[PDB]
Design an enzyme around this catalytic site. Structure first.
Site, PDB file in Angstrom:
ATOM      1  CG  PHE A  27      -8.255  13.088   1.660  1.00  0.00           C
ATOM      2  CD1 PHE A  27      -8.670  13.428   2.916  1.00  0.00           C
ATOM      3  CD2 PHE A  27      -6.839  13.531   1.549  1.00  0.00           C
ATOM      4  CE1 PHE A  27      -8.113  14.043   3.719  1.00  0.00           C
ATOM      5  CE2 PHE A  27      -5.992  14.299   2.257  1.00  0.00           C
ATOM      6  CZ  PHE A  27      -6.740  14.512   3.479  1.00  0.00           C
ATOM      7  CD  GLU A  28      -6.720   6.221  -0.870  1.00  0.00           C
ATOM      8  OE1 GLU A  28      -5.435   5.525  -0.575  1.00  0.00           O
ATOM      9  OE2 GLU A  28      -7.738   5.634  -0.293  1.00  0.00           O
ATOM     10  CE1 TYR A  66      -4.186   0.887  -0.670  1.00  0.00           C
ATOM     11  CE2 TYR A  66      -3.475   3.027   0.219  1.00  0.00           C
ATOM     12  CZ  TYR A  66      -4.378   2.305  -0.483  1.00  0.00           C
ATOM     13  OH  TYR A  66      -5.360   3.264  -0.992  1.00  0.00           O
TER      14      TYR A  66
HETATM   15  C1  QGH Z   1      -6.189   2.911   5.001  1.00  0.00           C
HETATM   16  C2  QGH Z   1      -6.931   2.925   3.592  1.00  0.00           C
HETATM   17  N1  QGH Z   1      -5.850   2.637   2.692  1.00  0.00           N
HETATM   18  C3  QGH Z   1      -5.420   1.278   2.699  1.00  0.00           C
HETATM   19  C4  QGH Z   1      -6.379   0.252   2.816  1.00  0.00           C
HETATM   20  C5  QGH Z   1      -7.465   0.616   3.334  1.00  0.00           C
HETATM   21  C6  QGH Z   1      -7.876   1.617   3.902  1.00  0.00           C
HETATM   22  N2  QGH Z   1      -8.985   1.758   4.429  1.00  0.00           N
HETATM   23  C7  QGH Z   1      -9.544   0.588   4.316  1.00  0.00           C
HETATM   24  C8  QGH Z   1     -10.736   0.120   4.761  1.00  0.00           C
HETATM   25  C9  QGH Z   1     -11.008  -1.243   4.544  1.00  0.00           C
HETATM   26  C10 QGH Z   1     -10.130  -1.969   4.053  1.00  0.00           C
HETATM   27  C11 QGH Z   1      -9.051  -1.392   3.404  1.00  0.00           C
HETATM   28  C12 QGH Z   1      -8.628  -0.028   3.676  1.00  0.00           C
END
Ligand code: QGH
Length: 308
Positions: free
Chosen positions: A278-279, A121
């Site tokens: 949001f990321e 991730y």
């Molecule tokens: C901390 C964020 N980005 C990475 C992956 C992820 C997040 N949040 C969530 C909830 C359920 C399953 C997976 C995830």
């Protein structure tokens, strides 16, 4: 606070990185590409593909989850300045790297201690040592709809933090049993890595040096923390969202904190991000790059200060 949108191909430009030329940026998108913005009068070009199978006819602009295993889906990217190369973490092709001219990436690692990666991730490279630090969200569930659902339902706490060293080609397990570790960023001086545990609403600090080397400790509470990216001052920006007391609904904020856990700056995001998860928020060249899974344009923030 001013917002700018840059129309992009595919969907869900979630993560960014930058090279030495520092013209434009690189972003990972839903169809499996890493694309490069070339400037306001030259759009996006394809830069790289984690998946060796990626091809335009089958994968370009797809958001069909069924096509993900074949096309790939890159979740983070980190440029290594000393070596002019880009590290990649992908949901299907795992830890990879690609040279300066891009193209199809070379796969570096797919397991640790006999346990395959399921959903890499976040990634970051230590610019001095070239050592790579990265997270796996789960040791059971991948990024399929079925997987996401199980992670939520079982409050999956099988996340991991790894390092990869290019001079050994070995990968090492640093931490296990993390609670959805969706963010990881190294300190400016290389002495620690901060890790976001999304399901535990916190940031932990893992020591690379000092008397507590090889251990981690609680750092700061942050609601629903996502990606962490360090700025040029050595501080950390993390994405956050908090359920609103009295609402319904969330409030989305970028949160800047230091290595001691002090909250330094809180930026409520504007629409359309305001009420959405949001990321990532990443500060670069005086701009805040906003990563999201929910739009087909890149979002960037800047403050207008022409009056004071
Ligand atoms: C901390 C964020 N980005 C990475 C992956 C992820 C997040 N949040 C969530 C909830 C359920 C399953 C997976 C995830």
């Amino acid at each position: 606070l001013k917002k700018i949108f840059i129309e992009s191909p595919s969907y869900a430009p979630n993560a960014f990185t930058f090279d030495s030329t520092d013209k434009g940026f690189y972003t990972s998108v839903q169809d499996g590409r890493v694309i490069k913005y070339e400037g306001p009068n030259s759009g996006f070009t394809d830069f790289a593909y984690a998946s060796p199978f990626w091809n335009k006819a089958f994968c370009e602009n797809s958001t069909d989850p069924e096509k993900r295993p074949l096309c790939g889906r890159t979740y983070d990217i980190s440029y290594d300045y000393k070596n002019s190369q880009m590290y990649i973490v992908d949901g299907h092709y795992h830890l990879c790297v690609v040279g300066k001219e891009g193209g199809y990436a070379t796969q570096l690692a797919t397991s640790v201690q006999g346990v395959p990666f399921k959903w890499l991730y976040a990634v970051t490279v230590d610019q001095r040592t070239g050592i790579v630090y990265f997270t796996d969200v789960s040791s059971i569930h991948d990024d399929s709809p079925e997987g996401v659902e199980e992670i939520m339902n079982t409050s999956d706490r099988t996340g991991r933090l790894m390092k990869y060293d290019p001079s050994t080609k070995e990968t090492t397990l640093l931490l296990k049993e993390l609670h959805v570790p969706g963010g990881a960023e190294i300190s400016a001086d290389g002495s620690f890595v901060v890790v976001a545990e999304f399901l535990s609403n916190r940031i932990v600090k893992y020591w690379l040096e000092g008397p507590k080397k090889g251990s981690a400790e609680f750092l700061v509470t942050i609601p629903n923390p996502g990606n962490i990216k360090r700025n040029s001052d050595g501080h950390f920006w993390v994405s956050s969202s908090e359920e609103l007391d009295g609402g319904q609904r969330v409030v989305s904020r970028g949160i800047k904190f230091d290595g001691f856990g002090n909250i330094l700056q809180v930026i409520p995001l504007p629409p359309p991000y305001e009420g959405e998860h949001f990321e990532q928020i990443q500060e670069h060249d005086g701009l805040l790059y906003i990563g999201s899974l929910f739009h087909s344009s890149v979002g960037i923030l800047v403050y207008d200060d022409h009056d004071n």
